[PDB]
Amino acid sequence: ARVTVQDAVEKIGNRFDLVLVAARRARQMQVGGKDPLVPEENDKTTVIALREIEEGLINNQILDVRERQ
Amino acid sequence: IKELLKLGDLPTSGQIRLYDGRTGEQFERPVTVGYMYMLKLNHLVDDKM
Amino acid sequence: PLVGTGMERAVAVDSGVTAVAKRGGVVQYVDASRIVIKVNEDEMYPGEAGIDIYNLTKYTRSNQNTCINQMPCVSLGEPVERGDVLADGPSTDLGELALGQNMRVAFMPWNGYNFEDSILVSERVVQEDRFTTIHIQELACVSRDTKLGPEEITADIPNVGEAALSKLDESGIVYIGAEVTGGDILVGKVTPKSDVKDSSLRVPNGVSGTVIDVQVFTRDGVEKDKRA
Amino acid sequence: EFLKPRLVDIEQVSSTHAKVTLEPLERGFGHTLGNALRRILLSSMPGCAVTEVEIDGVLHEYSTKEGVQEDILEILLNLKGLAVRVQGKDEVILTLNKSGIGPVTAADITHDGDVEIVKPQHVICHLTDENASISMRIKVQRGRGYVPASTRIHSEEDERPIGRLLVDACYSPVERIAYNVEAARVEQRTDLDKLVIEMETNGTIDPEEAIRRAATILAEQLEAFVDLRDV
Amino acid sequence: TEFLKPRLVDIEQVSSTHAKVTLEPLERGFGHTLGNALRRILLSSMPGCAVTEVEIDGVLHEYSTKEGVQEDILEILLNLKGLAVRVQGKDEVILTLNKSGIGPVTAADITHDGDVEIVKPQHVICHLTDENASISMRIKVQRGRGYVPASTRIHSEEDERPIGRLLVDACYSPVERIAYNVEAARVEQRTDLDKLVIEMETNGTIDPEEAIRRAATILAEQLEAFVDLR
Amino acid sequence: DMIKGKQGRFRQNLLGKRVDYSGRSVITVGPYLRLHQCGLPKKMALELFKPFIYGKLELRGLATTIKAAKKMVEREEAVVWDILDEVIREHPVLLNRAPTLHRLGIQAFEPVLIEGKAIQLHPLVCAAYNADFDGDQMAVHVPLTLEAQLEARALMMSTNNILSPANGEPIIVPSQDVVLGLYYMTRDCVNAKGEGMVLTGPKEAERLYR
RNA sequence: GCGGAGAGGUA
Numbered sequence A: 001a002r003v004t005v006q007d008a009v010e011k012i013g014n015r016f017d018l019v020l021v022a023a024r025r026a027r028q029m030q031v032g033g034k035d036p037l038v039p040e041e042n043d044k045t046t047v048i049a050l051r052e053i054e055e056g057l058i059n060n061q062i063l064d065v066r067e068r069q
Numbered sequence B: 001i002k003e004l005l006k007l008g009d010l011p012t013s014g015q016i017r018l019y020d021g022r023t024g025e026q027f028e029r030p031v032t033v034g035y036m037y038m039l040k041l042n043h044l045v046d047d048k049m
Numbered sequence C: 001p002l003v004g005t006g007m008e009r010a011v012a013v014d015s016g017v018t019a020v021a022k023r024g025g026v027v028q029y030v031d032a033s034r035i036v037i038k039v040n041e042d043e044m045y046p047g048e049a050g051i052d053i054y055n056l057t058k059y060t061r062s063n064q065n066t067c068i069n070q071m072p073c074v075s076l077g078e079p080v081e082r083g084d085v086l087a088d089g090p091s092t093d094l095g096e097l098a099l100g101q102n103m104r105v106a107f108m109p110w111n112g113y114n115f116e117d118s119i120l121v122s123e124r125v126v127q128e129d130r131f132t133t134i135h136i137q138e139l140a141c142v143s144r145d146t147k148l149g150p151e152e153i154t155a156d157i158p159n160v161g162e163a164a165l166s167k168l169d170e171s172g173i174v175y176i177g178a179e180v181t182g183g184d185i186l187v188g189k190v191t192p193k194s195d196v197k198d199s200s201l202r203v204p205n206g207v208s209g210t211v212i213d214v215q216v217f218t219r220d221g222v223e224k225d226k227r228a
Numbered sequence D: 001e002f003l004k005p006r007l008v009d010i011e012q013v014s015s016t017h018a019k020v021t022l023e024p025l026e027r028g029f030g031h032t033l034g035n036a037l038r039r040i041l042l043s044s045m046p047g048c049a050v051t052e053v054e055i056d057g058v059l060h061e062y063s064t065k066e067g068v069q070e071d072i073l074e075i076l077l078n079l080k081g082l083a084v085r086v087q088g089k090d091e092v093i094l095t096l097n098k099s100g101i102g103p104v105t106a107a108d109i110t111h112d113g114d115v116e117i118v119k120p121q122h123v124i125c126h127l128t129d130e131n132a133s134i135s136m137r138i139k140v141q142r143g144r145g146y147v148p149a150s151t152r153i154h155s156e157e158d159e160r161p162i163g164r165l166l167v168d169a170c171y172s173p174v175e176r177i178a179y180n181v182e183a184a185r186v187e188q189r190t191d192l193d194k195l196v197i198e199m200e201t202n203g204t205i206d207p208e209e210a211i212r213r214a215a216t217i218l219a220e221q222l223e224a225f226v227d228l229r230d231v
Numbered sequence E: 001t002e003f004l005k006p007r008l009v010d011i012e013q014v015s016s017t018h019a020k021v022t023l024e025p026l027e028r029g030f031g032h033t034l035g036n037a038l039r040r041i042l043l044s045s046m047p048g049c050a051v052t053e054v055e056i057d058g059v060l061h062e063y064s065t066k067e068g069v070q071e072d073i074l075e076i077l078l079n080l081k082g083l084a085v086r087v088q089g090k091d092e093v094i095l096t097l098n099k100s101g102i103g104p105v106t107a108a109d110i111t112h113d114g115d116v117e118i119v120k121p122q123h124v125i126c127h128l129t130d131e132n133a134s135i136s137m138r139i140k141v142q143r144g145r146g147y148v149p150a151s152t153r154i155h156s157e158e159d160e161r162p163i164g165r166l167l168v169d170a171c172y173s174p175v176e177r178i179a180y181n182v183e184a185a186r187v188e189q190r191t192d193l194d195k196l197v198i199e200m201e202t203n204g205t206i207d208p209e210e211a212i213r214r215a216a217t218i219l220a221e222q223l224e225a226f227v228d229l230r
Numbered sequence F: 001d002m003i004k005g006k007q008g009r010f011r012q013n014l015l016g017k018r019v020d021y022s023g024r025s026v027i028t029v030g031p032y033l034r035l036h037q038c039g040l041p042k043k044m045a046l047e048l049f050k051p052f053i054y055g056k057l058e059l060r061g062l063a064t065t066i067k068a069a070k071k072m073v074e075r076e077e078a079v080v081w082d083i084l085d086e087v088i089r090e091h092p093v094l095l096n097r098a099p100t101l102h103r104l105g106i107q108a109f110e111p112v113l114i115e116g117k118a119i120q121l122h123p124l125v126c127a128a129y130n131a132d133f134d135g136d137q138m139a140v141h142v143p144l145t146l147e148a149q150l151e152a153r154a155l156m157m158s159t160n161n162i163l164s165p166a167n168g169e170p171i172i173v174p175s176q177d178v179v180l181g182l183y184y185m186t187r188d189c190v191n192a193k194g195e196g197m198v199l200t201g202p203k204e205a206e207r208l209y210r
Numbered sequence G: 001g002c003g004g005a006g007a008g009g010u011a
């Protein structure tokens, strides 16, 4: 289990819209419109989206550019 | 109480040296052992859960 | 209690849970339901005396759903005096109050399993089966008289598998001594409409024990009720 | 370059209590072997014990017979303590039939060949009436450890007869284990130790067999250790 | 009767001397009995080779100072305790160190003998300063079981020896660190089973897996006299 | 009277509702736990996560229809426990103790399925809860929606709340056994076994002590 | 058989 989200909050310092972007990503992941960019280790889609956020691949702007594309 | 403990051939201080059942090693500083009257109260987890 | 205060006998005797001799004598018959004592000639009434009989109470339900059981203390042929303790009530032994049980404790922190006021216990305690209590739940199925027609207690119950009936008698009530589990049908009832629906009582979810007793109270005084 | 322990004199103080000695123990292995065996003995010694009982006139554990003073539940509690040795079969059916006034002890059980009643004086019940008669059929199984009724309920396997009375199974003969590592003066050596294991059991497993089986179990687990896949 | 055998030997060898070993599923309570037996045997009774005594050509007592070595004598003793050497045939052999010049006198600088191999040639021993830089010593290494502190031998030093023979604690057992955790593990229906995680650090000579191997081996030879059900 | 007053309304039914997917039980020590987890009884976990169980059962095809999923949960076969383990994996639950005095009275944990009927609470967090293992009980809620899960794991999880919101100081400080053990371990004695010997590191210190 | 009174108890 991912015991700390400290690096994800260091990516976006509000610590609140972090939850929103991670929820949007994990909702695009659960209802299978999209695919994970990280090799999953039997995590559920919430911890997958946090693991993706902490690695710098996804934020709000990447979501907006990919959605309009 | 000390007298009664002596009559039974038990340590007068009421503490005994105990061995750890997992490791087998002795505990430093002997520990108080003895019989105490305990009660099971009507608060049963299976009723609470 | 290995360490008491002496008040144990006062409390046990003065409470009504013990069976105490009224006229001292000699124990004539001992059973796990009754103690029959032949009175001594001193205390023996001249006219129309007879013997003394103490019926004991076996597992009954207390207000809190705990068990109320009396055990005999005395054996055949032992002499008893007026005011001695014949039978032990619930949580009393030989006349003394035995609220709980006395076990070997050691005061030490054992890898934080007794961290806060929590308690660590050895499997030997469960092996010797010394903290196992008997509890007793009461359940009631009531068949009233509706204006659409009286409901029935019969064992013919709509759309139930014969698995559920297997443990039911022809009258529709569980056998004494049957082991039940949550959801099993305690008694068969049909709601008049005539049937197709069941108001039959079931064991509450997640409680499982043995049916020790069943009672039937009928204002109708019907001639032919089996359980009755 | 090692030494190795050989099983030496096995003193029997009582029928249940026994002292077993192991003389040539290397320095440091006294406590190691003492504790390992203590653990194995207390946890894993296979024994036989009563699993369920059928008495005639009794529907459930809570009823009562005429002419006895114990409740049926106390009779089961007494049976749990019954120390028995089964030799060949895994499940035996013992039959107890007694009449008349007197204490029904374990000796009154119908004597079968393969079953040994270790403590015939062990009481079961007390009759109190001339015409009062108790009959029961006790089913005894072999097993290891401690298995309660409520767990076996998952595997009910047609418990349908209401006459059946389930008993908690203490499938374990060893009651107590203590060990002392003490200086073992060997005629040509300075510092060698001897392990003395004092054990109290219900008198079914013999000491030699207990120690041998415990060492066997520990050795099997060690076998599991010898190979290491790393694949 | 029929027991439950461990089905897996997961081994996570980070930093070759450091090995984590996982074992599941194990019968109730055997986690601690087996883990501890192994731990104790490894720690207290394990055949190995180590420096026992040392003779310095220059200093007579452990509190004296050698000119031009910044490290105190105690530092040199501590560095000598860490030397992990494996000798093949001989029981007790005496290695010599002779060094001059600036820099760190390391284990490689020992005279290279036939049967004796020093697993860590780069282990620092001393630091030598300028223009004098004279270090000479004779270190005696012996084979033994377990850990033997200096104090117990120096106690029994009635065989009076000439001065300069400085005793060092003998670290024979190759295991530097050993610990075991037991944790819950269930085989799909039985929950009262446990997993054994053994964290082990050895001193280079033997890798931890094989150390564990010979530990379990030793315990089995001792047990051999009783075990006969096969 | 229905509107005004404590028992009546706004307080009672409009700020004080009574949620679903919630449970209650006695709390217990569970020292082996990680700071971010909590022992949760199997049977309670199954009861709480029932609809999740049904969804996962239908996805794998183990059950044709929803009623068959209900029957399979009500028998509680091995497949059901496997599905429960799989769904519970990263799903966090909220633990609350009756007087939720400050925001640390509710915290999120990852549950670990255990036998028994008592909830196992990590010792270090007891100070935050003012929890004591003397019959204290705790309630356990399940965040359902995806947004709730992110909020529980990011904002509310136990490990994210180590400093008190009131003052900056740590909340998770060791309480009594931990501090006693550490105190015993670190205090020195004038003379003992191994007085004044020189060690190359902590590793041989443990070698010596053990 | 949703509710509400009264009594007792838990933390």
Ligand SMILES: Nc1ccn([C@@H]2O[C@H](COP(=O)(O)CP(=O)(O)OP(=O)(O)O)[C@@H](O)[C@H]2O)c(=O)n1
Binding pocket: F099, F130, F131, F132, G011
């Ligand atoms: N009528 C009540 C009685 C108790 N409580 C609550 O239950 C807990 C008992 O504390 P407590 O005082 O019993 C034990 P603690 O606070 O940890 O101190 P100690 O262990 O050193 O003795 C407290 O959190 C109280 O807020 C309540 O809401 N209403």
Ligand SMILES: [Mg+2]
Binding pocket: F131, F132, F133, F134, F135, F136, G011
């Ligand atoms: Mg409390």
